[PDB]
Design a protein around this nucleic acid. Sequence first.
DNA 1: GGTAGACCTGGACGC
DNA 2: GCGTCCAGTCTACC
Length: 314
Amino acid sequence: GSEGHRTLASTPALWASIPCPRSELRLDLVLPSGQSFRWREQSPAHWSGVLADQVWTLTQTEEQLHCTVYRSQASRPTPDELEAVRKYFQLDVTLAQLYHHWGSVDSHFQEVAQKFQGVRLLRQDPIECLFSFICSSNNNIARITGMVERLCQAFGPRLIQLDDVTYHGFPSLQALAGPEVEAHLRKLGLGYRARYVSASARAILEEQGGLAWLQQLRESSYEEAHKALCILPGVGTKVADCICLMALDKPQAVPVDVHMWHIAQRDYSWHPTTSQAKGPSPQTNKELGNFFRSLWGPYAGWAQAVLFSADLRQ
DNA sequence: GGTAGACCTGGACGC
DNA sequence: GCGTCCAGTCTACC
Ligand SMILES: Nc1nc2[nH]c(N)nc2c(=O)[nH]1
Ligand SMILES: [Ca+2]
């Protein structure tokens, strides 16, 4: 009982709650949907992963989000620690207000959103988000998840061990810039993205001024941020958009992938207009992004997450 | 400025 | 069982 991944039932005294209705968040729809790749449902309806340099397990009831953290004497999450979670899930943003608005201007959204509530955006660490999505290009969520895992296991700080699972913090820039990192990543199966991670780690550290350069984009403008990211190797329109949206507070950023193209064509009968090409291309992708923004507004990136997540459930 | 394949790696087909 | 197909970014021309 004292060992292994905790459960709300097995270690009651070891869980603190946070007011949060299923309407505001659905762990099962958010955590495995390709925003963050480091959450695993170790026990049914119980998700474990690293949050703010500590390992947590989370599970929810109808109106509560149950949180438990592994740090020395096993205690309960403190009010400050719970605050780290509220920030991770950006709980100050009311999902119901957004859903209402989107559903109100988009018929199709209302339709889909009635069966997929609780899909919101995680507020992620810039570095993890950056490299995690560099590994996402021309790839599938299942594969990306393993790559990210092995990556953290090889270059990330070892945290704690639950059962046979050893958790690691996300690798530092210096670590990812180290010697022979690409080669090691290749043996780890990242394919040609091994070089991207390495190259981008070094470019940021030995050309852009380092971490301060990234962290600073949060205050910059979507246009600026997205522009600056494409500098980095392996970071194109999509990855840049994912980073802006998921880690830089750019809620209007709309990543364009295979899923968003299908959704556009199938549910909106969309077609590029200002672009002569009628298939994916730097031009058409850019236009699609604008179309969704024009369609959903300032939080288009969040609306996009709802449909994207629902489109995975096929 | 705007299109072609080429591209690591498996799960999933189709044959 | 073996050969496609599929889940973005970059480069080589046009
Ligand atoms: N459009 C889009 N593509 C994605 N890829 C991954 N991995 N996550 C997303 C997402 O949220 N949106
Ligand atoms: Ca594709």
